[PDB]
Write a protein that binds this ligand. Structure first.
Ligand SMILES: CCC1=C(C)/C(=C/C2=NC(=C\c3[nH]c(/C=C4\NC(=O)[C@H](C)[C@H]4CC)c(C)c3CCC(=O)O)/C(CCC(=O)O)=C2C)NC1=O
Ligand SMILES: CCC1=C(C)/C(=C/C2=NC(=C\c3[nH]c(/C=C4\NC(=O)[C@H](C)[C@H]4CC)c(C)c3CCC(=O)O)/C(CCC(=O)O)=C2C)NC1=O
Ligand SMILES: CCC1=C(C)/C(=C/C2=NC(=C\c3[nH]c(/C=C4\NC(=O)[C@H](C)[C@H]4CC)c(C)c3CCC(=O)O)/C(CCC(=O)O)=C2C)NC1=O
Ligand SMILES: CCC1=C(C)/C(=C/C2=NC(=C\c3[nH]c(/C=C4\NC(=O)[C@H](C)[C@H]4CC)c(C)c3CCC(=O)O)/C(CCC(=O)O)=C2C)NC1=O
Ligand SMILES: CCC1=C(C)/C(=C/C2=NC(=C\c3[nH]c(/C=C4\NC(=O)[C@H](C)[C@H]4CC)c(C)c3CCC(=O)O)/C(CCC(=O)O)=C2C)NC1=O
Ligand SMILES: CCC1=C(C)/C(=C/C2=NC(=C\c3[nH]c(/C=C4\NC(=O)[C@H](C)[C@H]4CC)c(C)c3CCC(=O)O)/C(CCC(=O)O)=C2C)NC1=O
Ligand SMILES: CCC1=C(C)/C(=C/C2=NC(=C\c3[nH]c(/C=C4\NC(=O)[C@H](C)[C@H]4CC)c(C)c3CCC(=O)O)/C(CCC(=O)O)=C2C)NC1=O
Ligand SMILES: CCC1=C(C)/C(=C/C2=NC(=C\c3[nH]c(/C=C4\NC(=O)[C@H](C)[C@H]4CC)c(C)c3CCC(=O)O)/C(CCC(=O)O)=C2C)NC1=O
Ligand SMILES: CCC1=C(C)/C(=C/C2=NC(=C\c3[nH]c(/C=C4\NC(=O)[C@H](C)[C@H]4CC)c(C)c3CCC(=O)O)/C(CCC(=O)O)=C2C)NC1=O
Ligand SMILES: CCC1=C(C)/C(=C/C2=NC(=C\c3[nH]c(/C=C4\NC(=O)[C@H](C)[C@H]4CC)c(C)c3CCC(=O)O)/C(CCC(=O)O)=C2C)NC1=O
Lengths: 172, 225, 60, 162, 172, 163, 162, 172, 162, 162
């Protein structure tokens, strides 16, 4: 597993050198904004059932085919599976947002997920749509100004969107 | 499959029995990957030596250790983890997609250690290994509960005596049975390259008939008489 | 908490072994299994299903 | 590597669950100590050359026989490899300061350390002496919590050698 | 592994409505003939040693290269393996006959069996021939009208023939 | 996959590496004897499905007067229409279980994943227990004998799962 | 029981090693986040009766059908049990605040939750509404980091309920 | 895994033949040179640390890119795995030398070694170089006349050379 | 196959260790045993035909009912198969003598023997009697150490038949 | 302890089988090799004093710094420790000779040797030089195959240290 710090360390080690002062300043900035990052991760963690229910509602409004008999979310078993996959992917996006590196998401969640879905018969397009819907539902909670000190957190929004987009592009 | 003995460890034993048991255990449970001395678990084998835990309890501890998690869990899909855990803990490959669903849901709900216990507390594990013999690859010989796909899938999971399940491959730790178990297909039976010279002169397909260069026809009475 | 279960396998276990067979080497009758609290119920259920009889259960 | 953020995420991942308040409090502690640790890493990087020169000299001072002909320290290649090794240890100490975890030291030095030292007949006492010189000299530098941060990792390396 | 009833239920579920009156008539007729089906499964079960001895004798008469030094049934180990495989395939054919469906046979027995034999160097055509001979002996035993009430069972004979022929085709 | 009498028979014989002996054929004979009342119950339930669905929806409404109110799940035409859809799903999986003479269809379609889906979509299991108790009441009016008994047992299994 | 310090110790105990810089920094984060957690625990434990009564009335408002006869709310013993249960939830959230870990909630509330809530027909949405009431009040009874601590633990209980 | 004796037995069995007079003569000659074989095996076993040490010294003197940051023996973990590989190859070479057949190498030592090294990105030419250096160092200890009876053991030298060359050729 | 050298190598390998002094003394013992074992193999190979035909006649003498029609040993093909089987047994005994291990007998005869005998209703007492005649004759074809080796392997086959 | 008879019994027992030809061949080889082994044990037992004294002197010759103040060879207690350890090595070597197996050396010396030497900062190279001196002097003391037996055991000890 890699966070930003371990990624910098590995990059510096490949060339076999001490970390430059510039890299130290970048990592210091990351640590400085760590508290905003912790708030973003807590916003994701604390509102996961809401994010997932909203995303599933919208997804199954757009795509009735999934919940019809013969669809890929028809019985409670496959619907439970759909909701579980959403919660797992969201969990891993939150992990990545905390780490600052999507290595955890790539290694654990997205490692072989497209072809696993293809083998199962799952429409990867619909999974990417569900990840996009979770991104949109989560952004609302990331910009919730209540219960937190007010400040600029646009970079965290960009990074969370990039992790959601990365998941949605790896899946489909 | 035939040459290495099944290593069994009971409550009292000598030094060499203990050391050989440990070598076999580390060479099976940790794949065939090099476990460094700093990674060697000392308290677990002290408890094994005392008799506090059985070899089964030692396997349970090792599969819960950071060596096992760092190799086969933290940089893997759950499919890859389940394949590896079936191979190393149950000596076989997953037979059905329902097994993957079961184990993924079990890890999601109850955690990693409940997953490891589902492997080691299973009646299959105790039927084949009990408490004293180290797990071994067991679908290379037919057993009362095998399935047609099991041999091929274990062969797919097994990379040779000099091969291993390592996360340090440049392509990472990737699942190889994730597409075939879902589609209920057999495994791949392509073996490594050093075995091509072995028993070249056998002719298993002896009864197979060589085709003629030209199919024989009968122009006048029709073309198959 | 930790529970030590002294189990002595009996004829109910012997018949099961005579039917299924020894995929694992034959062992003595009585022995003790040390389990945590979490595993305690599955361990007892398994020993009951296999026919093994518990001599006793102690806590520690 | 196994840094604070990484066992946080790894425990959450193993348990199949989101990140709770314990995880985020540990992460907050990491981000808090990240200032003295990076100050220490910067100071050690800036003084790398003098630290390596002094460490090699200390090793030769405590083990004079090593420099005698027919011994592992005789020659120029061996002493250059000595400075190379001490620069390695210092580099990975600074990495473990930056990463806020002993992961870089565990993965690039400590793993395989004994086997390698045994095969090439490298006395761990040489490296313990050099790391003790590093410890002493970073005592002169690094007033404050940077001192404690650096000394934890130098002592971790020393304990691995012993 | 599913039987005739679960097959009907799955087909109905895919289209997503109740089992039609024709389907229920089919399944009730199946259950009415299930007594004769039990007779057929008993015929296969009580005569397995006879069937497999007959098939093995015929097979090693037609194919002598199997039982002579170098052959794939030469030593006792491989001969025992051959007879064991015969037992197994007959067992799964009787399972499928009781089920009224060939899902247990295909899913549990014959799925990776050609791949196994190809990896081991076993003539899959010889295995198919053995299954054909074993089908013939089994069909001799199924038709036996002793100890059992006389009546038409042609559907059962044809169905057992399809199960053996499917096994042969899957191996070869 | 589906835990039908034939299926446990075959899977048990398979886990022991043996042919189907006398006891397994005992069980199979029993199932084939079930299939007359079971199929008749399935036929009766299939014919009377529409009245059962409407009555179950109404019984749920009466037992939960508030849900139909605005700001709650029962409000809306879509919610009630696919309330009817869910009740149809339950009814035809009951028919499936009757035909197969096993809870396999119920265990595999509705029961598995039931709680997590109910939680995620915030659906009270008590609504469905009420609808099933209504159909349980109507079963005596529509069925009789062992056919009634089989249908009642399968509805009770569905209820106990929902409980 | 699951606290930050407990995981600190348990990881090293599994790995058979002494506590290290990584785990010590995690414990530092715990000790520094102790003070707002203890302040939140003080505020939550002082106002316990008012919170309990307000939460009971909030549940009876959000679910008017509960109070009418034949239901779970009709009955003085039942409503006493309601106050008892909401006070239990508040007490265990205070315990989690004090321990800086969800361990008291995990051991005492979350474990064995759904099975008994099902066996006694205790709808979890009642307790969800009560916890949301406690959340809304703790929004005003607290300020700064103590507010975040209490909110995190209340949200953990809520997500454990739904 | 075979020795010379079981190899001869397998050939005779493929013929279906008792072993010939000349075959038994060659086997008795092999078993009469057995003590020299044992001395050679003991020379490999007893000097293994020296063999791996001087082989590794020469290899890392020649190929300095292996021990640079970014090389394949750089961190202690990779260096330790390197020395373990050299140890293992020497051990299996001694096994083959005692057995008189190189079947142990391709059955066990080289069973998946090339695929392993290609997956890891190990330069197989450097492993071939390491095995060659181990051959060079081994030949000094094999030829050592010290403290054993003087005689012609040149066939053993050739056989050990062939085993080392087989390992090298299978790797590269 | 499981011979002295192969057991040595495999036991050492599965323990990840070189060949020690004990293993080499086992190999030395095998190399010394080679002389009587190979001479016994020579003697039994030279006299294979009289041995096998006498063994078949011994079987027919101890089991007279077999030759009568309707049972196993009636007819030229069945008796030819009998001679072929005893020739197989003698061949694999000679292979074992050459290899100095029960490997060839175990792999080629002992494994799967009982199942084949049950499948074709071949009585093990037949083969035991034939091997007993072989034992009596090798008592008169060999002497000293070779006699002991051949008897060892013949008794191994007999004990594994009964 | 790991002896030839021990390996025989263990290998035949784990497979749940009686002893057979290969196993008794290994035992025969051991009983044959016994005579040179006991010869060598007698020879080493008679010369233990001279051998140990010379080995200590050889260690001090090879590593002169050991005797200087502040090192391990300073003090008569440490010198007695040295001679004591070399006497232990020689005694266990003769045990290995008598038992015809590396069992005694394995159990009493090799198992735990690395961590003990690491803990007490005992250099293995000291013991390797001592054992090399003993190995040289066995040639002047022994001749024939007894010399070879002694040399395999001494080289086993040296390899265990190296
Ligand atoms: C395998 C068989 C199966 C069942 C049983 C099933 C039930 C089911 N009903 C649903 C919708 C719904 N179900 C209800 C509940 C009903 N509506 C109200 O009129 C009544 C009070 C109440 C029934 C008594 C509601 C309100 C919704 C829409 C809102 C939501 O679920 O979020 C959903 C969510 C997906 C969707 O349909 O949009 C499921 C999974 N689905 C299945 O595939
Ligand atoms: C640890 C990281 C990881 C993940 C997340 C993962 C996903 C995953 N999803 C699975 C099945 C599934 N996944 C889904 C969800 C999809 N289908 C729906 O239509 C949606 C479009 C979409 C979700 C938004 C469904 C329905 C199944 C069941 C497929 C089936 O039974 O055919 C399975 C097989 C287990 C099963 O059948 O239940 C895995 C392993 N694997 C991993 O190793
Ligand atoms: C126990 C777990 C834990 C959490 C949750 C935590 C969060 C946390 N958030 C903080 C402030 C903050 N929080 C945010 C983030 C917000 N700013 C905008 O409103 C966004 C909507 C939103 C982004 C998600 C910002 C910008 C600050 C100010 C920090 C600064 O100015 O440097 C602070 C500094 C103290 C203060 O609030 O005055 C902490 C410690 N710390 C912890 O130990
Ligand atoms: C059948 C006996 C057997 C063999 C032969 C064997 C070889 C072997 N070597 C390995 C790794 C390795 N092998 C090497 C050695 C090579 N790289 C250097 O460049 C050298 C030139 C060269 C050695 C001379 C290295 C460096 C690794 C570690 C690769 C890595 O961690 O990235 C691995 C992967 C194990 C793991 O990393 O967990 C295996 C299986 N294993 C066995 O059980
Ligand atoms: C590699 C070692 C090996 C052995 C030893 C072996 C024995 C063997 N003998 C067989 C046949 C037979 N063998 C016999 C032997 C009997 N004939 C009588 O005159 C005697 C009383 C008696 C012998 C003492 C007979 C009668 C058969 C024919 C049984 C049948 O009808 O299939 C068969 C059945 C296959 C076939 O038809 O050829 C086997 C497997 N096979 C092996 O692969
Ligand atoms: C549950 C379903 C299932 C089946 C059916 C199955 C068959 C099976 N047959 C095998 C070997 C074998 N199978 C045969 C039988 C064939 N070769 C002969 O020539 C005949 C022509 C023919 C039989 C009529 C033989 C001889 C072997 C041994 C091949 C060898 O070891 O080299 C093996 C390899 C493991 C072993 O030796 O026991 C399997 C797994 N496995 C399963 O899990
Ligand atoms: C222990 C398991 C079990 C068995 C064995 C069993 C046999 C069985 N066969 C029956 C009749 C029958 N059995 C058969 C089958 C025969 N028809 C042809 O001769 C074929 C050779 C053969 C089947 C392929 C037929 C045609 C009937 C008459 C039709 C009927 O009564 O169902 C009956 C009904 C009573 C009777 O008429 O005698 C039973 C109970 N039932 C069981 O529960
Ligand atoms: C330490 C953690 C813990 C909790 C949280 C807990 C809750 C709890 N409440 C119970 C009783 C009850 N609890 C309630 C609560 C209701 N009263 C109504 O006013 C409201 C709608 C609602 C509360 C918001 C009711 C009605 C009962 C009695 C009904 C029954 O037991 O079935 C019971 C069954 C045994 C008993 O106490 O009599 C439990 C286990 N128990 C615990 O050990
Ligand atoms: C990333 C972590 C890492 C470390 C620490 C490391 C150290 C290291 N130093 C080595 C060589 C060496 N290192 C030394 C060091 C000695 N020189 C004397 O001046 C001193 C007394 C003493 C040092 C304090 C010597 C003498 C050698 C050569 C040993 C030989 O060739 O046998 C070697 C053997 C391979 C080579 O020739 O380069 C290693 C593995 N390598 C690594 O990859
Ligand atoms: C405990 C394990 C064990 C060992 C190690 C062992 C070795 C051994 N080496 C021997 C002689 C020998 N050893 C060698 C080998 C050496 N000659 C030199 O030229 C080469 C450098 C080198 C290898 C070619 C030779 C050529 C002989 C004499 C040949 C002979 O004995 O017939 C002898 C017979 C001594 C005699 O009869 O005079 C034995 C028993 N025996 C054992 O039981």
């Amino acid at each position: 597993m890699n966070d930003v710090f371990t990624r910098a360390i590995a990059q510096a080690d490949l060339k076999g050198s001490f970390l430059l002062e510039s890299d130290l300043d970048k990592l210091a900035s990351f640590a400085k904004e760590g508290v905003k990052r912790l708030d973003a991760v807590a916003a994701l963690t604390n509102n996961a059932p809401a994010i997932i229910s909203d995303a599933a509602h919208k997804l199954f409004a757009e795509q009735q085919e999934l919940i019809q008999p013969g669809g890929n979310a028809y019985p409670h078993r496959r619907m439970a599976a759909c909701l579980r996959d959403m919660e797992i992917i969201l969990r891993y996006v939150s992990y990545a947002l905390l780490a600052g590196d999507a290595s955890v998401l790539d290694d654990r969640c997205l490692n072989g997920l497209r072809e696993t879905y293809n083998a199962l018969g799952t429409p990867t397009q619909s999974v990417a749509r569900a990840v996009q819907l979770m991104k949109d539902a989560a952004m609302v909670h990331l910009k919730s100004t209540a219960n937190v000190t007010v400040g600029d957190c646009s970079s965290l929004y960009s990074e969370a969107a990039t992790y959601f987009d990365k998941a949605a592009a790896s899946i489909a | 499959a035939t040459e290495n003995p099944k290593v069994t460890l009971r409550a009292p034993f000598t030094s060499e029995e203990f050391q050989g048991a440990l070598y076999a255990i580390y060479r099976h449970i940790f794949g065939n990957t090099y476990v460094m001395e700093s990674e060697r678990p000392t308290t677990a084998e002290s408890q094994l030596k005392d008799g506090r835990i059985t070899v089964r309890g030692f396997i349970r501890l090792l599969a819960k250790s950071e060596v096992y998690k760092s190799r086969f869990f933290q940089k893997t899909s759950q499919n890859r983890f389940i394949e590896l855990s079936h191979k190393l803990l149950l000596g076989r490959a997953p037979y059905d997609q329902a097994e993957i669903s079961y184990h993924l849901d079990l890890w999601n709900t109850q955690g990693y250690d409940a997953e490891i216990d589902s492997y080691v507390d299973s009646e299959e594990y105790l039927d084949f290994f009990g408490e004293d013999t180290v797990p071994f690859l067991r679908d290379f010989k037919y057993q009362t509960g095998q399935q047609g796909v099991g041999y091929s899938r274990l062969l797919n999971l097994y990379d040779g005596y000099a091969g291993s399940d390592t996360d340090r491959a440049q392509s990472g730790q990737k699942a190889r049975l994730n597409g075939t178990i879902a589609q209920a297909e057999p495994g791949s039976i392509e073996r490594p390259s050093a075995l091509q010279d072995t028993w070249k002169f056998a002719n298993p397909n002896y009864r197979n008939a060589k085709p003629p260069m030209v199919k024989a026809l009968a122009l006048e009475p029709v073309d198959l008489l | 908490r930790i529970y030590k279960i002294t189990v002595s396998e009996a004829g109910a276990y012997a018949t099961n072994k005579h039917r299924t067979g020894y995929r694992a080497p034959i062992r003595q009758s009585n022995y003790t299994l040390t389990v945590p609290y979490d595993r305690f119920l599955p361990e007892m259920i398994r020993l009951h299903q296999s026919g093994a009889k518990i001599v006793n259960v102690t806590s520690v | 590597s196994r840094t604070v953020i990484t066992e946080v995420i790894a425990t959450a991942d193993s348990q199949g669950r989101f990140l709770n308040s314990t995880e985020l409090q540990a992460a907050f502690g990491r981000f808090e100590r990240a200032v003295p640790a990076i100050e220490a890493a910067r100071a050690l990087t800036k003084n790398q050359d003098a630290l390596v020169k002094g460490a090699v000299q200390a090793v030769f001072k405590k083990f004079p026989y090593v420099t005698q002909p027919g011994e592992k320290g005789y020659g120029d290649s061996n002493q250059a490899k000595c400075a190379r090794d001490i620069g390695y240890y210092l580099r990975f100490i600074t990495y473990s300061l930056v990463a806020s975890g002993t992961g870089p030291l565990d993965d690039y030095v400590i793993a395989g350390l004994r086997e390698v030292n045994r095969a090439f007949n490298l006395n761990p006492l040489w490296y313990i002496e050099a790391l003790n010189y590093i410890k002493g000299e970073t005592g002169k530098l690094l007033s404050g919590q940077s001192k404690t941060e650096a000394l934890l990792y130098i002592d971790h390396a020393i304990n691995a050698l012993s």
